[PDB]
Amino acid sequence: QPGQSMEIDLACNGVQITGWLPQVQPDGLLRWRPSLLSVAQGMQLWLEHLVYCASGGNGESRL
Amino acid sequence: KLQKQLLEAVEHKQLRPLDVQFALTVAGDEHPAVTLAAALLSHDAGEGHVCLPLSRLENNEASHPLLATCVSEIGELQNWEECLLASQAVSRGDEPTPMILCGDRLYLNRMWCNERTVARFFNEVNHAIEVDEALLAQTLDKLFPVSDEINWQKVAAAVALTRRISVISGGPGTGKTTTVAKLLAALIQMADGERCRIRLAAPTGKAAARLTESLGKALRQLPLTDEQKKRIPEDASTLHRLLGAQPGSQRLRHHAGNPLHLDVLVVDEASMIDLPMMSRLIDALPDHARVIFLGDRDQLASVEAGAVLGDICAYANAGFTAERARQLSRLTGTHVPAGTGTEAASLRDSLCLLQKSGIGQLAAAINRGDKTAVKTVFQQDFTDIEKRLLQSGEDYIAMLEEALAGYGRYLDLLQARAEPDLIIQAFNEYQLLCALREGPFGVAGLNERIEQFMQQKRKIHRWYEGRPVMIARNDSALGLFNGDIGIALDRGQGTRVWFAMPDGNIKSVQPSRLPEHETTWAMTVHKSQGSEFDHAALILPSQRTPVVTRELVYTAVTRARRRLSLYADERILSAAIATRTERRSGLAALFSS
């Protein structure tokens, strides 16, 4: 679904996290890469999904 | 064909090997008119010129006499538009073609996309930001005490706040930095709960540290709470570091995909922003970000080939639109003048010129006739301005004699065996500025005569002990950039050149470790922009050449903090004041559309 990039500011353990998550649709996070399934790609989506669920963002994340 | 004819231009040094090979590959076997037209286009693009209008290429009055070999080829068809567009090497912009011919100006697709991106961003995509006029007026009233007369600084703050993209134009010492502090203070005070992210940027790290200290002194003159002082920007970085320019490659970490994360951005000394960097900065900006540019219209970097700000402020002389003059009257609480006629609405409303500042009276008389110029340098002497008539060589030696007087304090500190840090600050007390690069008057001319005057007089014997040196090209490894100065002396560990880091720490560099260095006793007026000099001297040739221009002499006078001296002919200097730098860029032609 069409979506816009959002900016993230969070407080975790008194540490501020700043960054951008591109192409955030109202359903959730959607990423696609042309490679083999690996745990490095799952860990990459994991950190991106946790920072997505910490600020609003009700929904799933798929890769 | 014309190929072998173009091979002579390399020996004649009228064309670089890049221009000739680009002309053989792209134009190919087509008419020799198309081959040399891409040759002079690649040459002017190499020197920094944006485009190549067809009228300049046709007239025999143009340079590169290899052009006279065109009459034997083009056969005087008198149509450059019909010949060039017919070939596949030139198109109207529809096809993916290297060269583009549109408004009679021929130039590369690179310059075409950069001209289109810049001229559109100022004409389009910008939105008028509507805020409460009563509250915005109450804020500006508390910043500026005097409401009795029209304040140019009050209009500059109102225009920048009401418009997303804006430019504040003004000369050195006119209070530009103070107006920015009033703009940033009124910006943070406007939105209490909304996020305010401010960034300071400069093309050079030199003027960047000049921006941080000057903005710091001006901001502490105004009261703010702890939340406002928390949103105060920290420091400024180089525009290349802001965009994340890699030293090895040309790629940028931001570009179109990753926008800069910001609210407002202030770019100081926008005169050194060439068209490539302005076009690369526009695509990096998000849609919610307001950008403010700082600089002057008459600075030589604005009128130089490839510059943007020069043609932007050229329309500022017309004035504000009739409607904005009524809107700014309700904001500033004064009567704002309205410009006559309607040329470009979005561009004229986004510009502001600060006319309030011997240096100021002379520079203001430069734009006027020579009658006010000769009268200002003459009577009352202003104590900041002196004039020496230079014709015969006997006055040329006395020029070098007073040149030693300006370096008199500097030359002694070299021979007094001081520390490098104080001497770095000492070399900023005097500098020499010359129009031409070569000849009896010029960079190549003075450096030989000046160092010869250092042999005749025993002040310093000749890397020689106590020599000042400037860096010719940027270096990412050593942390030193073009336009920076250094002092070479023996601390007892060895002969090493020392530099002053923005953090205040001294950094020793071996003489063989510098990427590029040259004798800095005389500087090119373009290379000294952004630097400050307590005393300055201008060297102009007795010859009449178009190289000497108005914006060159302007940047020479504005390059001096307080003291200034001049050696020039009243006939040569005043006539050069009338002559102004000609810009070929098609930006001002698109604003008229």
From Swiss-Prot, chain A:
Disruption phenotype: Decreased degradation of DNA with free ends that is unable to undergo homologous recombination, which can fortuitously lead to more efficient viral infection. Cells are deficient in DNA recombination repair and have increased sensitivity to UV light. The cultures have many inviable cells. Cells can be transformed with retron Ec48-containing plasmids. The holoenzyme may undergo conformational shifts upon DNA binding: the nuclease domain of RecB may swing away from the DNA exit tunnel in RecC. When Chi DNA binds to the RecC tunnel, the nuclease domain may then swing back to its original position (that seen in crystal structures), allowing it to nick the DNA 3' of the Chi site and then rotate to load RecA. At high Mg(2+) the nuclease domain may swing back more frequently, explaining differences seen in assays performed at high Mg(2+). Belongs to the RecC family. A helicase/nuclease that prepares dsDNA breaks (DSB) for recombinational DNA repair. Binds to DSBs and unwinds DNA via a rapid (>1 kb/second) and highly processive (>30 kb) ATP-dependent bidirectional helicase. Unwinds dsDNA until it encounters a Chi (crossover hotspot instigator, 5'-GCTGGTGG-3') sequence from the 3' direction. Cuts ssDNA a few nucleotides 3' to Chi site, by nicking one strand or switching the strand degraded (depending on the reaction conditions). The properties and activities of the enzyme are changed at Chi. Heterotrimer of RecB, RecC and RecD. All subunits contribute to DNA-binding. Interacts with YgbT (Cas1). In the RecBCD complex, RecB has a slow 3'-5' helicase, an exonuclease activity and loads RecA onto ssDNA, RecD has a fast 5'-3' helicase activity while RecC stimulates the ATPase and processivity of the RecB helicase and contributes to recognition of the Chi site. This is RecBCD enzyme subunit RecC. It comes from Escherichia coli (strain K12). The gene is recC. The chain holds residues 936 to 998 of 1122 of the full protein.
Curated annotation (Swiss-Prot), chain B:
Residues 246 bind DNA. GO terms for biological process: DNA damage response; DNA recombination; double-strand break repair via homologous recombination; recombinational repair. It comes from the Bacteria. Pfam families: AAA_19, RecD_N, UvrD_C_2. Keywords: ATP-binding, DNA damage, DNA repair, DNA-binding, Exonuclease, Helicase, Hydrolase, Isomerase, Nuclease, Nucleotide-binding. One of its GO terms (cellular component) is exodeoxyribonuclease V complex. Signal peptide: none annotated. Heterotrimer of RecB, RecC and RecD. All subunits contribute to DNA-binding. In the RecBCD complex, RecB has a slow 3'-5' helicase, an exonuclease activity and loads RecA onto ssDNA, RecD has a fast 5'-3' helicase activity while RecC stimulates the ATPase and processivity of the RecB helicase and contributes to recognition of the Chi site. HAMAP family: RecD. The holoenzyme may undergo conformational shifts upon DNA binding: the nuclease domain of RecB may swing away from the DNA exit tunnel in RecC. When Chi DNA binds to the RecC tunnel the nuclease domain may then swing back to its original position (that seen in crystal structures), allowing it to nick the DNA 3' of the Chi site and then rotate to load RecA. At high Mg(2+) the nuclease domain may swing back more frequently, explaining differences seen in assays performed at high Mg(2+). This is RecBCD enzyme subunit RecD. It comes from Escherichia coli (strain K12).
